Design a protein around this ligand. Sequence first.
Ligand SMILES: CCCCCCCCCCCCCCCCCC(=O)OC[C@H](COP(=O)([O-])OCC(O)COP(=O)([O-])OC[C@@H](COC(=O)CCCCCCCCCCCCCCCCC)OC(=O)CCCCCCCCCCCCCCCCC)OC(=O)CCCCCCCCCCCCCCCCC
Ligand SMILES: CCCCCCCCCCCCCCCCCC(=O)OC[C@H](COP(=O)([O-])OCC(O)COP(=O)([O-])OC[C@@H](COC(=O)CCCCCCCCCCCCCCCCC)OC(=O)CCCCCCCCCCCCCCCCC)OC(=O)CCCCCCCCCCCCCCCCC
Ligand SMILES: CCCCCCCCCCCCCCCCCC(=O)OC[C@H](COP(=O)([O-])OCC(O)COP(=O)([O-])OC[C@@H](COC(=O)CCCCCCCCCCCCCCCCC)OC(=O)CCCCCCCCCCCCCCCCC)OC(=O)CCCCCCCCCCCCCCCCC
Ligand SMILES: CCCCCCCCCCCCCCCCCC(=O)OC[C@H](COP(=O)([O-])OCC(O)COP(=O)([O-])OC[C@@H](COC(=O)CCCCCCCCCCCCCCCCC)OC(=O)CCCCCCCCCCCCCCCCC)OC(=O)CCCCCCCCCCCCCCCCC
Ligand SMILES: CCCCCCCCCCCCCCCCCC(=O)OC[C@H](COP(=O)([O-])OCC(O)COP(=O)([O-])OC[C@@H](COC(=O)CCCCCCCCCCCCCCCCC)OC(=O)CCCCCCCCCCCCCCCCC)OC(=O)CCCCCCCCCCCCCCCCC
Ligand SMILES: CCCCCCCCCCCCCCCCCC(=O)OC[C@H](COP(=O)([O-])OCC(O)COP(=O)([O-])OC[C@@H](COC(=O)CCCCCCCCCCCCCCCCC)OC(=O)CCCCCCCCCCCCCCCCC)OC(=O)CCCCCCCCCCCCCCCCC
Ligand SMILES: CCCCCCCCCCCCO[C@@H]1O[C@H](CO)[C@@H](O[C@H]2O[C@H](CO)[C@@H](O)[C@H](O)[C@H]2O)[C@H](O)[C@H]1O
Lengths: 168, 53, 231, 135, 80, 85, 105, 103, 62, 383
Amino acid sequence: TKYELKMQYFDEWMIRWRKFQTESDWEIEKGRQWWRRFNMAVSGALFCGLVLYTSGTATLKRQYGLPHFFDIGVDGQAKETMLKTLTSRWRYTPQGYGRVLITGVPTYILFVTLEHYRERRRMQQYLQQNTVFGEQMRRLLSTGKIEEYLPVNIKATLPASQQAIYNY
Amino acid sequence: WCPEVRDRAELEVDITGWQWWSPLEERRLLPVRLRSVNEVREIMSKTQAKKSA
Amino acid sequence: MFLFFFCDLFWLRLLLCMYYCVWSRLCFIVYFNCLMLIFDFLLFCLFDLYLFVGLCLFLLLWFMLFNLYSLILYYCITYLNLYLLFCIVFLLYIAFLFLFCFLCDFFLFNNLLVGDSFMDVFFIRFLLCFLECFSLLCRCLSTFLRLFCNLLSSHFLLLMFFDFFYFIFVFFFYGVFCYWFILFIFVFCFCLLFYVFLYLLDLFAAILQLFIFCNMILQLIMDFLLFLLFV
Amino acid sequence: VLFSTYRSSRLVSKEFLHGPVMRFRALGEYYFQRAWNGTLNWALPGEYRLYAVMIPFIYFYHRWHNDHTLDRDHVEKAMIMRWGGTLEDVRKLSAKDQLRVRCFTDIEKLYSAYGPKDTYLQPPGDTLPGKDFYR
Amino acid sequence: YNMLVFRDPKRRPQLSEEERAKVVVNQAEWPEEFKDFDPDDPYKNSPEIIKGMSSWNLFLWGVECAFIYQFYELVFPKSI
Amino acid sequence: SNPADHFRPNLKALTLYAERQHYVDRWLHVKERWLAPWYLPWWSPLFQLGTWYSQRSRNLFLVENHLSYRPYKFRRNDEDRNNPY
Amino acid sequence: GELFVRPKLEEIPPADQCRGFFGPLNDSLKFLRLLDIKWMMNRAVAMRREYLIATPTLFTFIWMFTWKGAVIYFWGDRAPPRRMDWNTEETGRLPLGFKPTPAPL
Amino acid sequence: VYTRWKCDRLPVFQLKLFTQEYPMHAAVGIFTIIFLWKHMSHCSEETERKYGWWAGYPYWRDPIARRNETKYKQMIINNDVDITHPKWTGCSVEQLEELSRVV
Amino acid sequence: MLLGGFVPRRFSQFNRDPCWMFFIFSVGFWLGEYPAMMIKYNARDLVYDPHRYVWSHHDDHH
Amino acid sequence: MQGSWSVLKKNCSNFFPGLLAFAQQTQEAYGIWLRIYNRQQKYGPTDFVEQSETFSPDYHKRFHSQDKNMWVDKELCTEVSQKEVARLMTYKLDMWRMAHCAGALLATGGYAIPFGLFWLANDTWVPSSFNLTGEELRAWREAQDLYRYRSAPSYLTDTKWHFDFHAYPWNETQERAWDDLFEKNDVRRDPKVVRPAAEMYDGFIKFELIRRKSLRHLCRSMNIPTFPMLARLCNGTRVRDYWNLAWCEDYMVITQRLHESMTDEELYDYAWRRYLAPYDKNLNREQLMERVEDYFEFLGPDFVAHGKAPNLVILTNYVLGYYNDPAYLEGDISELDKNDYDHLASWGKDAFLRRLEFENGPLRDQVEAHTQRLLAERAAIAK
Ligand SMILES: CCCCCCCCCCCCCCCCCC(=O)OC[C@H](COP(=O)([O-])OCC(O)COP(=O)([O-])OC[C@@H](COC(=O)CCCCCCCCCCCCCCCCC)OC(=O)CCCCCCCCCCCCCCCCC)OC(=O)CCCCCCCCCCCCCCCCC
Ligand SMILES: CCCCCCCCCCCCCCCCCC(=O)OC[C@H](COP(=O)([O-])OCC(O)COP(=O)([O-])OC[C@@H](COC(=O)CCCCCCCCCCCCCCCCC)OC(=O)CCCCCCCCCCCCCCCCC)OC(=O)CCCCCCCCCCCCCCCCC
Ligand SMILES: CCCCCCCCCCCCCCCCCC(=O)OC[C@H](COP(=O)([O-])OCC(O)COP(=O)([O-])OC[C@@H](COC(=O)CCCCCCCCCCCCCCCCC)OC(=O)CCCCCCCCCCCCCCCCC)OC(=O)CCCCCCCCCCCCCCCCC
Ligand SMILES: CCCCCCCCCCCCCCCCCC(=O)OC[C@H](COP(=O)([O-])OCC(O)COP(=O)([O-])OC[C@@H](COC(=O)CCCCCCCCCCCCCCCCC)OC(=O)CCCCCCCCCCCCCCCCC)OC(=O)CCCCCCCCCCCCCCCCC
Ligand SMILES: CCCCCCCCCCCCCCCCCC(=O)OC[C@H](COP(=O)([O-])OCC(O)COP(=O)([O-])OC[C@@H](COC(=O)CCCCCCCCCCCCCCCCC)OC(=O)CCCCCCCCCCCCCCCCC)OC(=O)CCCCCCCCCCCCCCCCC
Ligand SMILES: CCCCCCCCCCCCCCCCCC(=O)OC[C@H](COP(=O)([O-])OCC(O)COP(=O)([O-])OC[C@@H](COC(=O)CCCCCCCCCCCCCCCCC)OC(=O)CCCCCCCCCCCCCCCCC)OC(=O)CCCCCCCCCCCCCCCCC
Ligand SMILES: CCCCCCCCCCCCO[C@@H]1O[C@H](CO)[C@@H](O[C@H]2O[C@H](CO)[C@@H](O)[C@H](O)[C@H]2O)[C@H](O)[C@H]1O
């Protein structure tokens, strides 16, 4: 299922009618942002791990060998530990397109899958909302079209000092 | 009717070789000329001596 | 908002088509230094240092078709806008800069930290590095600003002087028939001299500004070029 | 397979419009393909006659465009604002009156910043209409 | 010579004085266009492009064109 | 003023106007039409290129909580500094 | 200007010789090397790793001159006003008696 | 022999030039074009009146008002919009009729 | 680059080449438009517009 | 080669059989490569196995080093035969092109179908397995040779122009080697005369410093797909692997003299994989043997002695010189009797042209003498 094609219209409409954005929807969007950042972090960690695993033995020796910039002692211990751990077993160290594929395709797949499922989660969350945004989302998924000016049609709640327009 | 020159120039330009001066190759080839008869005699004598030894 | 307009080069495009349907040699170039970067033999560069030649030649042609012909009265410099020139210089300068940066050779920037180890790192060298990193962008901005301001000022001055000359020539030529004809003749001769001088100055300045515009970009490129020696 | 990427794939015969093309090339080559026609970056040729012919033509067509399309707008604005503020009011005048007004506009253009300012500043005591004449 | 910024090109001599002195000049073989040839006025005898059309005539033609351009509206004015 | 007016393009022919909402919506419709078919899986790089950046920008806009007021981009008058409305 | 050759392992001075803001962070003060920026700069200069100082700067400038500059200019949040228009959290809720459409099923 | 400039057609040479000769420049140009059309593609009516006309805005006919009138008429007619709806007017239809009878 | 070409020695030679003929025609236009403007814009019967003080560009650009 | 409908039909008909054959070849080549990789990892030098880093002296960019990152397995004949190596090389080419096509398909979903139609209409980028008959294989080889002809001259010109513009040879023998290296295939080049160019260019540029544009041209000339090129260290790795396999096979053949016992078609294929023998030349066994012996001689004794081949850039130029055909010249010499500027005859000569003809014509000496005498007289009168 392709949720982005449906959700783009809803996002544009919300930006156009952001005045009726309840704190719940704002929290939903903040959570979406946080999950995007988390997905970026985990994908970057996976990419770094794959890069390190496929790195050449001489490259690892140069990177995790002498000299030590700080020379505190913990730095050298950690570098030696990592170097021994990497160089103990045999590792597939491809070069060129092969390393590119190995390091990128898993990262891209992970990031895209996480983002797509988070988008589905956000669609569900907006469906479960009891606000005008949730009603708009449900109507969009029902009729397939975005109904603009909906908040004023169904007379969504307004501040006490702005209810004169509904006075009809 | 001088295809070699055409091809070389076109290829040099198509590979970002815009410059039209080659001082080094000219320096290598500028003093080339057909030898005189006496020079040919001397060269032949040198070759004969080399072959003999 | 979408405005449809045309450049003022259609006749010049027609002339280019007419006179360049057949090949012709080129021996005079405004900025010849883009072709000869290396002067000491046996020095060679693995970087594509000759990539700027085509852009240089095209920019020279475009700016010469516009600026030089602008001296003709009522000719329009269609591109004469500050931010448009900024966009052009941004394109060129930032493209070359990102070409150098995509190389992913951090040592290339070691020369940014000015001075030697004797100088204090934090209070002298780091400040100098900051100033130089700022100076790169300032050089870009100065290039585009200079190109804009030279043309603007030159054409303002030309318009004002031409207006004054028209005024005096039309509304005070009758003085030739009067007893104060000598004053009018002196003024007219001075105006002719000023006219000639201004035209010569503008002609020279346009070409010189194009030369400088290309030289700034070439200097940017040269600042990060490293030459190996043949052995 | 649909379209060729090579310029060698001809779409017409070699003799198509040969004569007119030869005439056009003769026009192009006669004055330009000469030793003394050394261009500066393809923009400034060495033949004097090229300048002598092209500068006047460029000036002529630019001036015609400016006079009949650009300054005409300013002239029309002046006529409209000074004689009713509407096009019909101007058309109510005769051709000679319009000519007089347009020539006065030309006078103003010629004076510019180097001339008397009574042409647009009303001296005190003047009996001519002011700015609120049509208001 | 010069006409504004346009300078008349001059052919560089190629013969030495000794060789030059031995040259025999025979203007009978020269074309009628170039006889008594003068470097300072080589086109004095050059034919006119149009017979009877003087430079002053063209100058006056341009002046008349300018006068028309400036005076036609005075005689045949048109409404806006 | 008059000398400054001489530095304008001299060959303006036509001007067209269009609201940002309208053409953005039309572009979204075209993008949906071309990205809808089944033979373009959602995990394809093309689909992500089409959708992810737009989604991220719109989410950033929605999450925005600014203490200041940003005047409407397409007001009738934006030249008065003392009237943001 | 000229070609750069990385120093050999034996040409790199020891860490103890490096100086901080006030003085060398020798034994009993090694863990302070992490926090002293000037000590790190001097160590990088000694180790010929000057790029660590120059690369972050230049890139930062670029990042400001290219992407963040305009982002701040066009979308940045200006200083808040004295009298603030806080949100009453009253808008958005559906009215009483409204029958929302059923969710997909 | 084969050369891109002499053998390939113009579109192919254009793609090759801007993909394998000057790709970074093309990328920067596209970026700048997008920026210009995203942030420098709007002109308010007041701005048009001030600077948008060669000789000045002709207030005696107000072409901007006519343009907007045509725009709104076309939108209303094509989209079948009831401009008498309470949201547009802020009052019920009966109140509108009462006002019409009053004035 | 101003390298060469036909160069008339004096005015009378401008008719020896079509290009210079057109050039001299253009010069005649250029120089003769000025006397025309003198005669037209300094005429006795020329009259300033009575409504010249009703409106001016100075108030418009101000 | 340009696409065509006949080739499109051929490839469409043989699409699925071609895929099946490619899968079988993939299994076989995976087995062969597993053997070779195990042998390399077990008996390879420490630098080769550990992938020692070689950085450029200007921008410190890592690239494969010919001496360290390339190793010739002299004892590979025990585990792997020559035919298996040739099969692996052919499969590597086919797999590269198939992988690029598959990447395009995965990237663009179902929108690559028309591009697939363009692909199947030309044999340039289709695998060899798509040909099920001799005529189809001949056409495919012709297309590959056409691509090589299209690409190689640019690479050769790039190398020669850069070196000649930025450097010159040290001694006369180097000059002769450099000049004779880039001769057209219509003449026979002596490998002994040409070899010193390898050391000279090693002095100028090694394989570790090869530029990205030159690499692109070389990969084009080797029928290696270049889009997306990406960094220079991917196609560089492909080139290194292919030439390492070729060098191993060459050492095997030289040691075992297999080429003498090799049959005509197999010999032609062996030369072709070295870019020595185009199929359109219709070479016989004598010419193939001569070219192969010249290639072995160019490799030099040091190749057998220590497994060290000459500079790879110069080797590639030398081998690709066989695809640098003489510049075409068509048309009878009688065509030179025509004229090119008849269309201008109607225009005649203007005053300036008449003056130039008069001054620089056969009467030039008389005019010069008259002018100089007149000028001298005028100067004397002035003084
Ligand atoms: C190679 C290229 C060379 C050539 C370069 C040429 C160009 C010149 C260079 C300069 C650039 C010029 C600019 C050109 C235009 C480019 C486009 C552009 O500018 O877009 C910016 C544009 C700016 O955003 P925006 O549109 O203005 O909107 C602003 C909003 O913030 C947007 O909101 P959002 O929702 O998108 O979120 C964005 C988020 C982005 O971040 C995230 O989403 C989360 C983090 C992502 C991490 C990614 C992976 C990193 C590695 C993971 C771990 C690996 C190791 C694993 C193993 C460990 C073993 C122990 O950032 C934030 O909002 C900030 C969050 C920070 C949280 C901090 C919390 C405090 C604790 C942590 C910090 C303090 C630690 C102290 C420790 C002290 C110890 C003593 O886009 C972004 O920056 C965000 C989107 C892209 C994110 C990419 C993330 C990866 C970045 C690369 C990392 C690796 C390379 C760098 C290191 C290399 C070392 C060798
Ligand atoms: C529609 C899809 C959209 C996709 C968008 C994403 C981007 C494009 C995707 C990929 C496109 C295909 C082509 C990519 C380039 C290929 C390059 C190449 O040929 O490499 C060959 C090369 C193979 O050759 P090799 O001989 O095996 O090894 C190379 C030699 O070592 C070479 O030896 P060497 O001598 O050259 O050694 C030097 C080498 C050494 O490096 C390597 O080669 C090693 C591999 C790279 C390591 C990178 C990680 C380094 C550590 C990062 C630590 C971060 C900590 C942060 C902590 C934060 C805590 C809060 O290079 C370096 O030193 C460069 C280091 C990187 C510097 C980064 C500077 C960034 C500045 C940022 C400025 C500010 C940005 C804005 C502001 C942001 C913040 C607000 O490949 C690699 O080594 C790795 C290739 C990886 C390719 C990229 C994979 C992409 C995955 C994407 C996943 C996410 C998708 C998101 C989709 C979103 C929706 C659409
Ligand atoms: C609603 C009203 C209508 C308008 C609708 C507009 C819709 C707009 C949609 C929204 C667009 C938003 C974005 C707009 C941004 C604009 C930016 C801008 O203007 O920047 C300035 C910038 C100015 O650039 P420039 O430096 O002046 O150079 C561009 C020039 O085109 C010169 O550059 P170049 O010379 O390098 O170009 C190459 C040139 C190379 O040179 C040539 O090929 C020479 C010819 C040049 C033609 C182009 C110049 C046009 C000159 C003015 C118009 C000519 C007269 C037209 C007469 C119209 C009468 C009503 O070749 C061509 O131009 C190829 C086309 C040749 C056509 C030949 C046709 C032959 C037909 C023969 C038929 C025979 C039938 C026989 C039947 C017998 C039966 C018995 O403009 C551009 O760069 C192009 C902007 C275009 C943007 C796309 C617009 C959408 C497409 C609209 C097409 C409308 C077609 C229907 C019209 C129907 C009549 C009303
Ligand atoms: C569904 C998700 C999709 C995601 C989006 C994907 C978008 C498309 C991107 C391209 C993806 C790959 C396409 C298929 C390629 C075929 C497989 C392959 O690698 O072939 C080998 C071959 C390796 O090339 P090489 O130069 O020989 O490698 C040098 C190494 O030293 C070689 O090392 P060596 O010398 O030791 O030799 C080893 C050799 C020895 O073996 C042999 O000799 C036997 C043959 C083995 C290979 C057979 C290949 C057959 C290809 C044709 C297949 C049939 C096609 C049929 C088409 C018609 C169908 C109707 O075996 C290999 O070739 C192994 C190579 C390493 C494996 C690479 C695969 C990694 C990714 C797969 C795992 C993913 C896990 C995800 C986990 C998720 C967790 C959350 O691949 C290529 O030709 C390279 C690809 C060329 C196109 C590049 C296009 C740009 C790619 C940029 C990627 C950036 C990251 C992703 C984000 C993108 C954002 C813009
Ligand atoms: C069922 C099958 C099996 C399953 C599938 C298997 C997988 C298949 C897929 C993989 C296949 C791979 C192999 C493909 C090989 C063939 C490739 C190819 O195309 O060859 C050229 C191929 C001919 O090849 P060939 O004859 O065999 O010669 C090959 C030679 O070896 C010549 O070789 P060459 O090397 O010299 O040629 C190479 C040439 C290839 O190119 C070409 O040759 C150009 C082709 C197009 C030419 C078009 C000319 C005609 C234009 C007409 C315009 C309209 C006219 C008016 C129409 C009016 C209609 C009413 O140049 C290039 O390679 C340039 C590459 C450029 C790459 C662009 C990358 C852009 C990246 C963007 C920047 C990103 C930066 C990072 C940003 C990161 C941000 C975070 O071209 C054609 O066949 C021309 C087709 C033209 C079609 C008609 C015109 C277009 C129609 C468009 C319709 C649109 C409809 C919708 C409109 C909607 C409007 C709203
Ligand atoms: C006079 C006016 C005429 C008209 C002019 C028209 C207006 C043009 C204006 C602008 C022109 C310049 C634009 C330049 C942009 C900047 C370029 C740049 O920075 O490039 C850097 C850089 C330069 O490339 P390069 O690899 O160094 O060498 C380029 C040479 O051309 C390689 O040359 P080579 O000789 O070394 O190799 C030759 C041969 C070598 O042979 C091979 O390599 C074997 C065959 C390989 C097949 C392809 C393998 C691909 C593998 C996967 C690649 C990664 C995918 C990433 C994920 C997907 C992202 C979408 O390769 C080929 O034959 C390539 C065939 C490609 C045919 C397609 C060309 C485009 C035609 C238009 C089709 C699309 C129209 C869309 C718009 C209309 C929609 C209705 O680009 C890359 O690194 C390539 C990245 C490619 C990523 C995928 C494409 C991303 C762009 C968006 C695609 C959207 C698809 C939409 C589908 C339909 C939707 C409805
Ligand atoms: C491959 C990885 C798969 C992971 C699958 C899921 C793992 C288990 C759940 C992980 C933890 C989730 O818990 C997560 O906590 C953070 C707070 O820290 C919440 O985040 C909340 O508070 C933070 C506080 O800064 C706000 O910025 C954010 O807007 C708000 O939503 C997330 O809404 C919640 O989802």
